[PDB]
């Protein structure tokens, strides 16, 4: 319940995500945009990311299960996930999607199944870490503490 | 007379991020989600700047830009009409937003009539650099 240690732990946790490559510097852009004029901005953008990506992953899963795989139906989903991940700084999801697009180009169905599994693993990882980040922030704020603003 | 800006982008996450960045820079934008919507907006308002995503459904930003340039040259939308677009001397600055693929080189943006480009993901500094050159 030490708020100073909670805040230091939150900084260290965030730093770990960058070191591990789960987030890249684009995530910091989002944190920089969150201020008194835009108070829950990061969580709002990330929640939209999860809503959209949940839907894309379910659509992609159906498309790869079909008897004849229509790759013109598949690629736009991989493209959208690549773009969304890039824009919130989910670097490992983005990189998995880059590889996926390569195997979509080559029409390689077995490789695509493997790529889908990898994207899901990376997506669930970054979802877990970001949900936890917001939980830690909310705890501190509800206890009368504060998250210092990213002034980078 | 605040500058009028049009953002053309199909990805909703990309829109939310670009909107907040532009707001912090002191600007609001109209939003179009594909090239047809861009042409509809451009036909009905006079913009000072257009930020044009390259890859979009229905009509992509490269074709949309060519059609807008044809309109600027001839004074009508007949190129757009022939290309299937439904439609009811002051050159628009059009800035591509590109996605790091072979299908989106800067030279290709230029070859379809775009003036400049920003490499995605959009950042505050990339937008700032662009606005300081193209908005007065
Ligand atoms: Mg697009």
PDB file of C-alpha atoms and ligand atoms in Angstrom:
ATOM      1  CA  UNK A   1       0.000   0.000   0.000  1.00  0.00           C
ATOM      2  CA  UNK A   2       3.100   2.268  -0.271  1.00  0.00           C
ATOM      3  CA  UNK A   3       2.077   4.677  -3.076  1.00  0.00           C
ATOM      4  CA  UNK A   4       5.620   5.804  -3.773  1.00  0.00           C
ATOM      5  CA  UNK A   5       6.701   2.177  -4.280  1.00  0.00           C
ATOM      6  CA  UNK A   6       3.535   1.472  -6.331  1.00  0.00           C
ATOM      7  CA  UNK A   7       4.394   4.319  -8.687  1.00  0.00           C
ATOM      8  CA  UNK A   8       8.049   3.128  -8.958  1.00  0.00           C
ATOM      9  CA  UNK A   9       6.812  -0.434  -9.632  1.00  0.00           C
ATOM     10  CA  UNK A  10       4.494   0.921 -12.369  1.00  0.00           C
ATOM     11  CA  UNK A  11       7.482   2.740 -14.027  1.00  0.00           C
ATOM     12  CA  UNK A  12       9.616  -0.413 -13.818  1.00  0.00           C
ATOM     13  CA  UNK A  13       6.775  -2.570 -15.211  1.00  0.00           C
ATOM     14  CA  UNK A  14       6.340  -0.149 -18.138  1.00  0.00           C
ATOM     15  CA  UNK A  15      10.082  -0.102 -18.810  1.00  0.00           C
ATOM     16  CA  UNK A  16      10.091  -3.941 -18.841  1.00  0.00           C
ATOM     17  CA  UNK A  17       7.477  -3.999 -21.646  1.00  0.00           C
ATOM     18  CA  UNK A  18       9.723  -1.791 -23.821  1.00  0.00           C
ATOM     19  CA  UNK A  19      12.820  -3.855 -23.023  1.00  0.00           C
ATOM     20  CA  UNK A  20      10.937  -7.041 -23.908  1.00  0.00           C
ATOM     21  CA  UNK A  21       9.792  -5.539 -27.277  1.00  0.00           C
ATOM     22  CA  UNK A  22       6.115  -5.859 -26.438  1.00  0.00           C
ATOM     23  CA  UNK A  23       5.717  -2.068 -26.803  1.00  0.00           C
ATOM     24  CA  UNK A  24       7.753   0.331 -28.960  1.00  0.00           C
ATOM     25  CA  UNK A  25       8.097   4.122 -28.925  1.00  0.00           C
ATOM     26  CA  UNK A  26       4.708   4.647 -30.652  1.00  0.00           C
ATOM     27  CA  UNK A  27       3.029   3.665 -27.374  1.00  0.00           C
ATOM     28  CA  UNK A  28       4.809   6.649 -25.810  1.00  0.00           C
ATOM     29  CA  UNK A  29       3.165   8.923 -28.422  1.00  0.00           C
ATOM     30  CA  UNK A  30      -0.175   7.805 -27.059  1.00  0.00           C
ATOM     31  CA  UNK A  31       0.884   8.457 -23.453  1.00  0.00           C
ATOM     32  CA  UNK A  32       2.097  11.939 -24.463  1.00  0.00           C
ATOM     33  CA  UNK A  33      -1.397  12.747 -25.835  1.00  0.00           C
ATOM     34  CA  UNK A  34      -3.092  11.908 -22.517  1.00  0.00           C
ATOM     35  CA  UNK A  35      -3.456  15.019 -20.315  1.00  0.00           C
ATOM     36  CA  UNK A  36      -6.116  17.097 -18.461  1.00  0.00           C
ATOM     37  CA  UNK A  37      -7.585  17.908 -21.909  1.00  0.00           C
ATOM     38  CA  UNK A  38      -7.791  14.125 -22.816  1.00  0.00           C
ATOM     39  CA  UNK A  39      -7.756  12.129 -19.480  1.00  0.00           C
ATOM     40  CA  UNK A  40      -8.460   8.462 -20.434  1.00  0.00           C
ATOM     41  CA  UNK A  41      -7.091   8.671 -24.004  1.00  0.00           C
ATOM     42  CA  UNK A  42      -4.647   5.693 -23.858  1.00  0.00           C
ATOM     43  CA  UNK A  43      -7.229   3.303 -22.435  1.00  0.00           C
ATOM     44  CA  UNK A  44      -9.836   4.529 -24.931  1.00  0.00           C
ATOM     45  CA  UNK A  45      -7.552   3.910 -27.945  1.00  0.00           C
ATOM     46  CA  UNK A  46      -6.365   0.559 -26.603  1.00  0.00           C
ATOM     47  CA  UNK A  47      -9.943  -0.589 -25.840  1.00  0.00           C
ATOM     48  CA  UNK A  48     -10.899   0.249 -29.428  1.00  0.00           C
ATOM     49  CA  UNK A  49      -7.832  -1.742 -30.567  1.00  0.00           C
ATOM     50  CA  UNK A  50      -9.038  -4.789 -28.605  1.00  0.00           C
ATOM     51  CA  UNK A  51     -12.666  -4.469 -29.904  1.00  0.00           C
ATOM     52  CA  UNK A  52     -11.548  -4.236 -33.511  1.00  0.00           C
ATOM     53  CA  UNK A  53      -8.767  -6.853 -33.232  1.00  0.00           C
ATOM     54  CA  UNK A  54     -11.011  -9.406 -31.421  1.00  0.00           C
ATOM     55  CA  UNK A  55     -13.357  -9.186 -34.406  1.00  0.00           C
ATOM     56  CA  UNK A  56     -10.531  -9.411 -37.007  1.00  0.00           C
ATOM     57  CA  UNK A  57      -8.998 -12.472 -35.325  1.00  0.00           C
ATOM     58  CA  UNK A  58     -12.365 -14.278 -35.306  1.00  0.00           C
ATOM     59  CA  UNK A  59     -12.900 -13.379 -38.997  1.00  0.00           C
ATOM     60  CA  UNK A  60      -9.370 -14.568 -39.922  1.00  0.00           C
ATOM     61  CA  UNK A  61      -9.943 -17.796 -38.018  1.00  0.00           C
ATOM     62  CA  UNK A  62     -13.088 -18.522 -40.087  1.00  0.00           C
ATOM     63  CA  UNK A  63     -11.362 -17.637 -43.349  1.00  0.00           C
ATOM     64  CA  UNK A  64      -8.460 -20.065 -42.772  1.00  0.00           C
ATOM     65  CA  UNK A  65     -10.857 -22.892 -41.789  1.00  0.00           C
ATOM     66  CA  UNK A  66     -12.770 -22.811 -45.117  1.00  0.00           C
ATOM     67  CA  UNK A  67     -12.260 -25.727 -47.526  1.00  0.00           C
ATOM     68  CA  UNK A  68     -10.971 -23.427 -50.300  1.00  0.00           C
ATOM     69  CA  UNK A  69      -9.055 -20.530 -48.703  1.00  0.00           C
ATOM     70  CA  UNK A  70      -9.864 -17.224 -50.404  1.00  0.00           C
ATOM     71  CA  UNK A  71      -6.613 -15.298 -49.761  1.00  0.00           C
ATOM     72  CA  UNK A  72      -8.190 -12.070 -51.058  1.00  0.00           C
ATOM     73  CA  UNK A  73     -10.544 -12.354 -48.053  1.00  0.00           C
ATOM     74  CA  UNK A  74      -7.637 -13.125 -45.665  1.00  0.00           C
ATOM     75  CA  UNK A  75      -4.993 -10.500 -46.479  1.00  0.00           C
ATOM     76  CA  UNK A  76      -7.140  -7.383 -45.735  1.00  0.00           C
ATOM     77  CA  UNK A  77      -7.609  -8.682 -42.161  1.00  0.00           C
ATOM     78  CA  UNK A  78      -3.865  -9.189 -41.675  1.00  0.00           C
ATOM     79  CA  UNK A  79      -3.271  -5.740 -43.184  1.00  0.00           C
ATOM     80  CA  UNK A  80      -5.734  -4.080 -40.768  1.00  0.00           C
ATOM     81  CA  UNK A  81      -4.218  -5.818 -37.714  1.00  0.00           C
ATOM     82  CA  UNK A  82      -0.721  -4.777 -38.862  1.00  0.00           C
ATOM     83  CA  UNK A  83      -1.825  -1.145 -39.145  1.00  0.00           C
ATOM     84  CA  UNK A  84      -3.675  -1.030 -35.810  1.00  0.00           C
ATOM     85  CA  UNK A  85      -0.782  -2.690 -33.943  1.00  0.00           C
ATOM     86  CA  UNK A  86       1.698  -0.350 -35.554  1.00  0.00           C
ATOM     87  CA  UNK A  87      -0.353   2.694 -34.524  1.00  0.00           C
ATOM     88  CA  UNK A  88      -0.525   1.723 -30.821  1.00  0.00           C
ATOM     89  CA  UNK A  89       3.057   0.393 -30.693  1.00  0.00           C
ATOM     90  CA  UNK A  90       2.324  -3.339 -30.244  1.00  0.00           C
ATOM     91  CA  UNK A  91       5.562  -4.167 -31.952  1.00  0.00           C
ATOM     92  CA  UNK A  92       5.591  -7.947 -31.601  1.00  0.00           C
ATOM     93  CA  UNK A  93       2.035  -8.200 -32.967  1.00  0.00           C
ATOM     94  CA  UNK A  94       3.040  -5.933 -35.845  1.00  0.00           C
ATOM     95  CA  UNK A  95       6.100  -8.039 -36.633  1.00  0.00           C
ATOM     96  CA  UNK A  96       4.069 -11.308 -36.539  1.00  0.00           C
ATOM     97  CA  UNK A  97       1.615  -9.705 -38.983  1.00  0.00           C
ATOM     98  CA  UNK A  98       4.488  -8.670 -41.325  1.00  0.00           C
ATOM     99  CA  UNK A  99       5.602 -12.324 -41.523  1.00  0.00           C
ATOM    100  CA  UNK A 100       1.937 -13.448 -41.977  1.00  0.00           C
ATOM    101  CA  UNK A 101       1.530 -11.155 -44.993  1.00  0.00           C
ATOM    102  CA  UNK A 102       4.581 -12.831 -46.592  1.00  0.00           C
ATOM    103  CA  UNK A 103       2.955 -16.244 -46.411  1.00  0.00           C
ATOM    104  CA  UNK A 104      -0.395 -14.821 -47.570  1.00  0.00           C
ATOM    105  CA  UNK A 105       1.398 -13.478 -50.660  1.00  0.00           C
ATOM    106  CA  UNK A 106       2.829 -16.932 -51.395  1.00  0.00           C
ATOM    107  CA  UNK A 107      -0.635 -18.528 -50.851  1.00  0.00           C
ATOM    108  CA  UNK A 108       0.935 -20.978 -48.346  1.00  0.00           C
ATOM    109  CA  UNK A 109      -1.913 -22.326 -46.200  1.00  0.00           C
ATOM    110  CA  UNK A 110       0.091 -24.373 -43.643  1.00  0.00           C
ATOM    111  CA  UNK A 111       2.405 -21.407 -42.973  1.00  0.00           C
ATOM    112  CA  UNK A 112      -0.635 -19.136 -42.579  1.00  0.00           C
ATOM    113  CA  UNK A 113      -2.119 -21.390 -39.873  1.00  0.00           C
ATOM    114  CA  UNK A 114       1.181 -21.163 -37.971  1.00  0.00           C
ATOM    115  CA  UNK A 115       1.300 -17.376 -38.454  1.00  0.00           C
ATOM    116  CA  UNK A 116      -2.279 -17.038 -37.121  1.00  0.00           C
ATOM    117  CA  UNK A 117      -1.370 -18.977 -33.972  1.00  0.00           C
ATOM    118  CA  UNK A 118       1.688 -16.686 -33.466  1.00  0.00           C
ATOM    119  CA  UNK A 119      -0.327 -13.471 -33.952  1.00  0.00           C
ATOM    120  CA  UNK A 120      -2.848 -14.734 -31.383  1.00  0.00           C
ATOM    121  CA  UNK A 121      -0.077 -15.510 -28.839  1.00  0.00           C
ATOM    122  CA  UNK A 122       1.434 -12.031 -29.270  1.00  0.00           C
ATOM    123  CA  UNK A 123      -1.987 -10.379 -29.228  1.00  0.00           C
ATOM    124  CA  UNK A 124      -3.020 -12.096 -25.990  1.00  0.00           C
ATOM    125  CA  UNK A 125       0.361 -11.170 -24.444  1.00  0.00           C
ATOM    126  CA  UNK A 126       0.042  -7.454 -25.198  1.00  0.00           C
ATOM    127  CA  UNK A 127      -3.641  -7.508 -24.148  1.00  0.00           C
ATOM    128  CA  UNK A 128      -2.676  -9.008 -20.743  1.00  0.00           C
ATOM    129  CA  UNK A 129       0.128  -6.499 -20.237  1.00  0.00           C
ATOM    130  CA  UNK A 130      -1.865  -3.409 -21.192  1.00  0.00           C
ATOM    131  CA  UNK A 131      -4.963  -4.427 -19.196  1.00  0.00           C
ATOM    132  CA  UNK A 132      -2.657  -4.826 -16.230  1.00  0.00           C
ATOM    133  CA  UNK A 133      -1.019  -1.436 -16.860  1.00  0.00           C
ATOM    134  CA  UNK A 134      -4.415   0.264 -16.639  1.00  0.00           C
ATOM    135  CA  UNK A 135      -5.311  -1.709 -13.512  1.00  0.00           C
ATOM    136  CA  UNK A 136      -2.145  -0.498 -11.787  1.00  0.00           C
ATOM    137  CA  UNK A 137      -2.750   3.117 -12.817  1.00  0.00           C
ATOM    138  CA  UNK A 138      -6.405   3.049 -11.638  1.00  0.00           C
ATOM    139  CA  UNK A 139      -5.398   1.610  -8.297  1.00  0.00           C
ATOM    140  CA  UNK A 140      -2.971   4.454  -7.656  1.00  0.00           C
ATOM    141  CA  UNK A 141      -5.441   7.185  -8.808  1.00  0.00           C
ATOM    142  CA  UNK A 142      -8.384   5.784  -6.739  1.00  0.00           C
ATOM    143  CA  UNK A 143      -6.039   5.766  -3.664  1.00  0.00           C
ATOM    144  CA  UNK A 144      -5.580   9.534  -4.025  1.00  0.00           C
ATOM    145  CA  UNK A 145      -2.242   9.114  -5.795  1.00  0.00           C
ATOM    146  CA  UNK A 146      -1.251  10.145  -9.252  1.00  0.00           C
ATOM    147  CA  UNK A 147       0.457   8.951 -12.376  1.00  0.00           C
ATOM    148  CA  UNK A 148       2.962  11.552 -13.455  1.00  0.00           C
ATOM    149  CA  UNK A 149       2.443  12.718 -17.045  1.00  0.00           C
ATOM    150  CA  UNK A 150       4.772  11.492 -19.750  1.00  0.00           C
ATOM    151  CA  UNK A 151       6.450  14.810 -20.739  1.00  0.00           C
ATOM    152  CA  UNK A 152       8.666  13.221 -23.417  1.00  0.00           C
TER     153      UNK A 152
ATOM    154  CA  UNK B   1     -10.069  31.739 -41.050  1.00  0.00           C
ATOM    155  CA  UNK B   2      -8.802  28.529 -39.436  1.00  0.00           C
ATOM    156  CA  UNK B   3      -7.287  26.109 -42.002  1.00  0.00           C
ATOM    157  CA  UNK B   4      -9.737  23.361 -43.164  1.00  0.00           C
ATOM    158  CA  UNK B   5      -8.182  19.889 -43.140  1.00  0.00           C
ATOM    159  CA  UNK B   6      -9.479  16.553 -44.532  1.00  0.00           C
ATOM    160  CA  UNK B   7      -8.281  13.222 -43.167  1.00  0.00           C
ATOM    161  CA  UNK B   8      -8.922  10.230 -45.432  1.00  0.00           C
ATOM    162  CA  UNK B   9      -8.330   6.945 -43.637  1.00  0.00           C
ATOM    163  CA  UNK B  10     -10.156   3.639 -43.367  1.00  0.00           C
ATOM    164  CA  UNK B  11      -8.682   2.389 -40.090  1.00  0.00           C
ATOM    165  CA  UNK B  12     -10.606   3.617 -37.008  1.00  0.00           C
ATOM    166  CA  UNK B  13      -7.648   3.231 -34.636  1.00  0.00           C
ATOM    167  CA  UNK B  14      -5.511   5.298 -37.013  1.00  0.00           C
ATOM    168  CA  UNK B  15      -8.267   7.964 -37.105  1.00  0.00           C
ATOM    169  CA  UNK B  16      -8.530   8.259 -33.295  1.00  0.00           C
ATOM    170  CA  UNK B  17      -4.763   8.650 -32.935  1.00  0.00           C
ATOM    171  CA  UNK B  18      -4.411  11.221 -35.808  1.00  0.00           C
ATOM    172  CA  UNK B  19      -7.401  13.215 -34.504  1.00  0.00           C
ATOM    173  CA  UNK B  20      -5.880  13.618 -31.041  1.00  0.00           C
ATOM    174  CA  UNK B  21      -2.479  14.511 -32.461  1.00  0.00           C
ATOM    175  CA  UNK B  22      -4.001  17.155 -34.728  1.00  0.00           C
ATOM    176  CA  UNK B  23      -6.043  18.493 -31.816  1.00  0.00           C
ATOM    177  CA  UNK B  24      -2.917  18.929 -29.721  1.00  0.00           C
ATOM    178  CA  UNK B  25      -1.452  20.838 -32.682  1.00  0.00           C
ATOM    179  CA  UNK B  26      -4.534  23.119 -32.663  1.00  0.00           C
ATOM    180  CA  UNK B  27      -6.570  21.675 -35.533  1.00  0.00           C
ATOM    181  CA  UNK B  28      -9.825  19.832 -36.144  1.00  0.00           C
ATOM    182  CA  UNK B  29     -10.412  17.772 -39.279  1.00  0.00           C
ATOM    183  CA  UNK B  30     -13.233  16.435 -41.411  1.00  0.00           C
ATOM    184  CA  UNK B  31     -13.070  12.636 -41.838  1.00  0.00           C
ATOM    185  CA  UNK B  32     -13.576  10.519 -44.974  1.00  0.00           C
ATOM    186  CA  UNK B  33     -13.145   6.699 -44.871  1.00  0.00           C
ATOM    187  CA  UNK B  34     -12.346   5.976 -48.569  1.00  0.00           C
ATOM    188  CA  UNK B  35     -11.533   7.767 -51.861  1.00  0.00           C
ATOM    189  CA  UNK B  36     -15.191   8.196 -52.875  1.00  0.00           C
ATOM    190  CA  UNK B  37     -15.963   9.925 -49.595  1.00  0.00           C
ATOM    191  CA  UNK B  38     -12.851  12.093 -50.112  1.00  0.00           C
ATOM    192  CA  UNK B  39     -14.070  13.193 -53.565  1.00  0.00           C
ATOM    193  CA  UNK B  40     -17.550  13.885 -52.148  1.00  0.00           C
ATOM    194  CA  UNK B  41     -15.997  16.075 -49.410  1.00  0.00           C
ATOM    195  CA  UNK B  42     -13.670  17.871 -51.826  1.00  0.00           C
ATOM    196  CA  UNK B  43     -16.496  18.535 -54.287  1.00  0.00           C
ATOM    197  CA  UNK B  44     -18.510  20.301 -51.529  1.00  0.00           C
ATOM    198  CA  UNK B  45     -15.855  22.154 -49.440  1.00  0.00           C
ATOM    199  CA  UNK B  46     -12.597  24.021 -50.094  1.00  0.00           C
ATOM    200  CA  UNK B  47      -9.807  22.364 -48.071  1.00  0.00           C
ATOM    201  CA  UNK B  48      -6.346  23.776 -47.308  1.00  0.00           C
ATOM    202  CA  UNK B  49      -4.792  20.320 -46.814  1.00  0.00           C
ATOM    203  CA  UNK B  50      -5.716  16.652 -47.322  1.00  0.00           C
ATOM    204  CA  UNK B  51      -4.027  13.771 -45.494  1.00  0.00           C
ATOM    205  CA  UNK B  52      -4.658  10.779 -47.769  1.00  0.00           C
ATOM    206  CA  UNK B  53      -4.243   7.162 -46.758  1.00  0.00           C
ATOM    207  CA  UNK B  54      -2.887   5.090 -49.642  1.00  0.00           C
ATOM    208  CA  UNK B  55      -4.585   1.710 -49.096  1.00  0.00           C
ATOM    209  CA  UNK B  56      -8.375   1.835 -48.629  1.00  0.00           C
ATOM    210  CA  UNK B  57     -11.387  -0.155 -49.861  1.00  0.00           C
ATOM    211  CA  UNK B  58     -13.823   1.011 -52.548  1.00  0.00           C
ATOM    212  CA  UNK B  59     -11.352   3.564 -53.926  1.00  0.00           C
ATOM    213  CA  UNK B  60      -7.735   3.826 -52.832  1.00  0.00           C
ATOM    214  CA  UNK B  61      -5.823   7.049 -52.201  1.00  0.00           C
ATOM    215  CA  UNK B  62      -3.602   6.775 -55.269  1.00  0.00           C
ATOM    216  CA  UNK B  63      -6.559   6.598 -57.681  1.00  0.00           C
ATOM    217  CA  UNK B  64      -8.506   9.204 -55.673  1.00  0.00           C
ATOM    218  CA  UNK B  65      -5.547  11.609 -55.978  1.00  0.00           C
ATOM    219  CA  UNK B  66      -5.317  11.058 -59.768  1.00  0.00           C
ATOM    220  CA  UNK B  67      -9.026  11.817 -60.060  1.00  0.00           C
ATOM    221  CA  UNK B  68      -8.722  14.966 -57.960  1.00  0.00           C
ATOM    222  CA  UNK B  69      -5.786  16.102 -60.148  1.00  0.00           C
ATOM    223  CA  UNK B  70      -7.913  15.482 -63.255  1.00  0.00           C
ATOM    224  CA  UNK B  71     -10.676  17.594 -61.750  1.00  0.00           C
ATOM    225  CA  UNK B  72      -8.173  20.362 -61.024  1.00  0.00           C
ATOM    226  CA  UNK B  73      -6.870  20.222 -64.612  1.00  0.00           C
ATOM    227  CA  UNK B  74     -10.194  19.998 -66.504  1.00  0.00           C
ATOM    228  CA  UNK B  75     -12.747  21.546 -64.134  1.00  0.00           C
ATOM    229  CA  UNK B  76     -14.975  18.437 -64.053  1.00  0.00           C
ATOM    230  CA  UNK B  77     -15.228  14.972 -62.533  1.00  0.00           C
ATOM    231  CA  UNK B  78     -15.590  13.060 -65.838  1.00  0.00           C
ATOM    232  CA  UNK B  79     -12.451  10.893 -65.171  1.00  0.00           C
ATOM    233  CA  UNK B  80     -14.094   9.881 -61.850  1.00  0.00           C
ATOM    234  CA  UNK B  81     -17.440   9.198 -63.485  1.00  0.00           C
ATOM    235  CA  UNK B  82     -15.815   6.904 -66.091  1.00  0.00           C
ATOM    236  CA  UNK B  83     -14.025   5.079 -63.267  1.00  0.00           C
ATOM    237  CA  UNK B  84     -17.412   4.329 -61.612  1.00  0.00           C
ATOM    238  CA  UNK B  85     -17.483   7.038 -58.922  1.00  0.00           C
ATOM    239  CA  UNK B  86     -21.005   8.290 -58.088  1.00  0.00           C
ATOM    240  CA  UNK B  87     -21.008  12.126 -57.995  1.00  0.00           C
ATOM    241  CA  UNK B  88     -23.867  14.524 -57.099  1.00  0.00           C
ATOM    242  CA  UNK B  89      -6.091  27.009 -60.461  1.00  0.00           C
ATOM    243  CA  UNK B  90      -5.796  26.359 -56.703  1.00  0.00           C
ATOM    244  CA  UNK B  91      -3.829  23.078 -56.255  1.00  0.00           C
ATOM    245  CA  UNK B  92      -4.827  21.121 -53.156  1.00  0.00           C
ATOM    246  CA  UNK B  93      -1.895  20.017 -51.014  1.00  0.00           C
ATOM    247  CA  UNK B  94      -2.275  16.197 -50.766  1.00  0.00           C
ATOM    248  CA  UNK B  95      -0.035  14.312 -48.340  1.00  0.00           C
ATOM    249  CA  UNK B  96       0.152  10.477 -48.590  1.00  0.00           C
ATOM    250  CA  UNK B  97       0.178   8.293 -45.482  1.00  0.00           C
ATOM    251  CA  UNK B  98       2.166   5.160 -46.441  1.00  0.00           C
ATOM    252  CA  UNK B  99       2.402   1.697 -44.855  1.00  0.00           C
ATOM    253  CA  UNK B 100       5.973   0.421 -45.498  1.00  0.00           C
ATOM    254  CA  UNK B 101       5.294  -1.928 -48.368  1.00  0.00           C
ATOM    255  CA  UNK B 102       6.448  -2.309 -51.964  1.00  0.00           C
ATOM    256  CA  UNK B 103       2.947  -1.106 -53.024  1.00  0.00           C
ATOM    257  CA  UNK B 104       3.493   2.269 -51.281  1.00  0.00           C
ATOM    258  CA  UNK B 105       6.846   3.807 -52.268  1.00  0.00           C
ATOM    259  CA  UNK B 106       7.095   7.572 -51.976  1.00  0.00           C
ATOM    260  CA  UNK B 107       7.925   7.652 -55.746  1.00  0.00           C
ATOM    261  CA  UNK B 108       4.582   5.907 -56.439  1.00  0.00           C
ATOM    262  CA  UNK B 109       2.742   8.473 -54.276  1.00  0.00           C
ATOM    263  CA  UNK B 110       4.417  11.186 -56.338  1.00  0.00           C
ATOM    264  CA  UNK B 111       3.559   9.348 -59.615  1.00  0.00           C
ATOM    265  CA  UNK B 112      -0.156   9.451 -58.670  1.00  0.00           C
ATOM    266  CA  UNK B 113      -0.078  13.187 -57.971  1.00  0.00           C
ATOM    267  CA  UNK B 114       0.612  13.418 -54.216  1.00  0.00           C
ATOM    268  CA  UNK B 115       2.812  16.325 -53.056  1.00  0.00           C
ATOM    269  CA  UNK B 116       4.430  14.722 -50.033  1.00  0.00           C
ATOM    270  CA  UNK B 117       4.166  11.748 -47.672  1.00  0.00           C
ATOM    271  CA  UNK B 118       4.249  10.677 -44.049  1.00  0.00           C
ATOM    272  CA  UNK B 119       5.420   7.182 -43.165  1.00  0.00           C
ATOM    273  CA  UNK B 120       3.067   5.405 -40.745  1.00  0.00           C
ATOM    274  CA  UNK B 121       2.684   5.247 -37.819  1.00  0.00           C
ATOM    275  CA  UNK B 122       1.830   8.971 -37.696  1.00  0.00           C
ATOM    276  CA  UNK B 123       3.644  10.847 -34.897  1.00  0.00           C
ATOM    277  CA  UNK B 124       3.263  14.372 -33.525  1.00  0.00           C
ATOM    278  CA  UNK B 125       6.659  15.348 -34.932  1.00  0.00           C
ATOM    279  CA  UNK B 126       5.867  13.960 -38.444  1.00  0.00           C
ATOM    280  CA  UNK B 127       2.587  15.912 -38.515  1.00  0.00           C
ATOM    281  CA  UNK B 128       4.216  19.025 -37.161  1.00  0.00           C
ATOM    282  CA  UNK B 129       6.918  18.916 -39.870  1.00  0.00           C
ATOM    283  CA  UNK B 130       4.302  18.491 -42.489  1.00  0.00           C
ATOM    284  CA  UNK B 131       1.962  21.300 -41.233  1.00  0.00           C
ATOM    285  CA  UNK B 132       4.725  23.834 -40.808  1.00  0.00           C
ATOM    286  CA  UNK B 133       5.528  23.525 -44.573  1.00  0.00           C
ATOM    287  CA  UNK B 134       2.005  23.187 -46.032  1.00  0.00           C
ATOM    288  CA  UNK B 135      -0.254  25.228 -43.653  1.00  0.00           C
ATOM    289  CA  UNK B 136       0.027  29.014 -43.428  1.00  0.00           C
TER     290      UNK B 136
HETATM  291 MG1  LIG C   1      -5.738   2.211 -45.143  1.00  0.00          MG
END
